[PDB]
């Protein structure tokens, strides 16, 4: 029973770290999409004032 | 964007100045040739030979 508990214990700790990595991956990717959208809109704001 | 606007203004002002500038000399040449005469021509040659 010691070793069978250890099985699920290491499972959960490693799996927690793994999903905690995939969430931070999503974090960075969403940062990149956010920043690219902000920049691509700011450029058309500039172009609006330029055309005015 | 705000400095591109100013560069456009400078460039437009310069082109306008250029046009007026060359029309000025074209007009002055036509006025001259329509208004030069012997009484003034003799006075010009007299001036320059007085300091030749």
- State whether B2 and A47 contact (CB < 8 Å): no
| Distance from C-alpha of A28 to C-alpha of A5, rounded to nearest angstrom | 35
Q: Packing angle between helix A2-51 and helix B2-35, nearest 10 degrees?
A: 20
Longest dimension (CA), chain B: 60
First-last CA distance in chain A: 76
Which residues of chain B have a Cβ shorter than 8 Å from any chain A Cβ?
A: 1-2, 4-5
Residue B5 near residue A46 (C-beta atoms within 8 A): no
Residues 6+ apart with CB under 8 A from A47: B1
Resolution in Å equals 3.1
Question: In this complex, is the C-beta atom of A49 within 8 Å of any C-beta atom belonging to chain B?
Answer: yes
Residue B5 near residue A50 (C-beta atoms within 8 A): yes
Q: Looking at chain B, which residue has its C-alpha nearest residue A51?
A: B5
Q: Cβ contacts (< 8 Å) between B1 and chain A: which residues?
A: 46-47, 49-50
Q: Which of A38, A51, A39 is nearest to B1 (CA)?
A: A51
Structural biology method used: cryo-EM
Q: Cβ contacts (< 8 Å) between A46 and chain B: which residues?
A: 1
Helix ranges (H only) for B1-52 are 2-35, 38-51
- State whether B2 and A49 contact (CB < 8 Å): yes
Q: Which residue has the tokens 């940062």?
A: A31
| Distance from C-alpha of B52 to C-alpha of B45, rounded to nearest angstrom | 10
Number of H helices, E strands in chain B: 2, 0
* CA B46 to chain centroid: 25
Helix (H) or strand (E) holding A32: helix A2-51
């Amino acid at each position: 029973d010691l070793d069978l508990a250890k099985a699920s214990a290491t499972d959960q700790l490693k799996k927690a770290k793994a999903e905690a990595q995939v969430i931070i991956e999503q974090a960075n990717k969403r940062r990149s999409q956010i920043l690219d959208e902000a920049k691509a809109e700011a450029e058309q704001e500039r172009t609006k004032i330029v055309a005015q | 964007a705000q400095a591109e606007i100013e560069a456009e203004r400078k460039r437009a002002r310069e082109e306008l100045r250029k046009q007026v500038a060359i029309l000025a000399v074209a007009g002055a040449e036509k006025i001259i040739e329509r208004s030069v005469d012997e009484a003034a021509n003799s006075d010009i040659v007299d001036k320059l030979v007085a300091e030749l």
